[PDB]
Design a protein around this ligand. Structure first.
Ligand SMILES: O=C(O)CCc1ccccc1
Lengths: 252, 249
């Protein structure tokens, strides 16, 4: 329901926008560069940058400006509070104890998978590997699960923007092979990726669905290719994922 | 900074956004009002502005954050120079030791690990510190506490009870004070299972050009594998060497 302009705090709209203008390409910003990129006057943007410094979100040498780790607290506020991650935390730690592997819940954010929940159970198998909190879609188990639950339209939309570049020697780079896998995932109800995103990383995932059948999130086990064979991952870990799926149906 | 340059709407809005948590996953206007110290009318506009900008959603009564909030943290992760600068040396120390290596800095009253080595270099039974840890019972925390002036230390200890987290956590202020002055004079800190059972941590300061504390460097190991004696003899030289390599901070 459209919000009235009397209710909009402009300093907050522009402040939050400014903070997103820091990047790998723009790690620091001067007043002139920030006025450009943001569309404000130098005099105005300087007040925003100084405000960020005073609040601890930024530092300056008096001419350049860059963000501090405090920016992480924003959005950590989202990870801590978000309903689905809080609902899925206990099952993630249970499956971590049942597998001694790294367990993750993946959701779509933009064109990537984010892992809002990663197991903190500390007894993982000797040789282990943990996925980062933000991963690409086409070469990961949770990404392919998500791609497979899109219909052809958004799929082709994603694939038009993202070209299947190889991240390891083993990455699949042919669109035809990948569509075969994507339909296999929807067929069988689970996905295994063998070292297409990261060397050593074997990942098994299952979809978690809502009552209408739509994809809400994924549940994945990451293990090291030097310990388990795919055979063993299927026989030992997949039934555990199917049990977590069933347990999670009343939570929905 | 003169207060004529402070945009109060940015200040209060960012302060508001941090009120959401696991204990506080949603907020109503009066809830947000009393938690933030702002009037009912002001906080209503902050929350509707967040909704309009895509950082929040509402059902006209409760408000909660969206994933767009992550882009604010992401801007730090993409752009920060220090983690990029130290990541090579951290993954080298992890290769040299087969232990979890971390770079810590103070954020608020916690240590945030700006860099943690990949879980893959680590063999054997191990235990990795979290992304954020308290100061009074960690190696990185005690290094930071030791390099503060007394008044800043007083202010930290006025805020934070020395709560037992394990059977072995130091809870006496006087003992903790004497540990802190030993760290300053020794140039390293070892903590034996005060934060987590089984976890032993050795740390050194990373100093800046002026001699001021910039970050901490720690190696975390497991008490079932190494004695404190072996940590000191085998791993401390590795950290002193990484200190020297980092002197162009
Ligand atoms: O020890 C670990 O594996 C990491 C702890 C952690 C928790 C939540 C997000 C990132 C890392």
């Amino acid at each position: 329901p459209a919000i009235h302009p009397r209710d909009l705090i402009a300093g907050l709209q522009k402040g939050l926008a400014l903070m997103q203008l820091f990047s790998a390409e723009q790690p620091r910003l001067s007043v002139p560069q920030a006025a450009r990129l943001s569309g404000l006057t130098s005099s105005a943007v300087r007040r925003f940058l100084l405000t960020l410094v005073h609040e601890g979100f930024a530092e300056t040498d008096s001419r350049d400006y860059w963000l501090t780790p405090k920016a992480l607290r924003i959005g950590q506020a989202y990870v801590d509070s978000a309903q689905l991650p809080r609902m899925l935390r206990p099952i993630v730690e249970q499956v971590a104890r049942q597998t001694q592997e790294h367990v993750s819940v993946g959701t779509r954010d933009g064109d990537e998978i984010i892992h809002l929940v990663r197991s903190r159970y500390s007894h993982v198998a000797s040789l282990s590997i943990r996925p980062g909190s933000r991963v690409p879609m086409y070469c990961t188990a949770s990404g392919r699960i998500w791609l497979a639950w899109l219909d052809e339209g958004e799929r082709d939309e994603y694939f038009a923007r993202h070209p299947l570049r190889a991240l390891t020697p083993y990455t699949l780079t042919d669109r035809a092979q990948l569509d075969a896998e994507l339909q296999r995932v929807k067929g069988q109800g689970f996905c295994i990726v063998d070292q297409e995103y990261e060397i050593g990383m074997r990942v098994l995932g299952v979809p978690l669905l809502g009552r209408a059948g739509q994809l809400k999130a994924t549940l994945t086990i990451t293990t090291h290719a030097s310990r388990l064979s795919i055979d063993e991952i299927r026989l030992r870990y997949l039934p555990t994922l199917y049990e977590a799926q069933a347990l999670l149906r009343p939570v929905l």
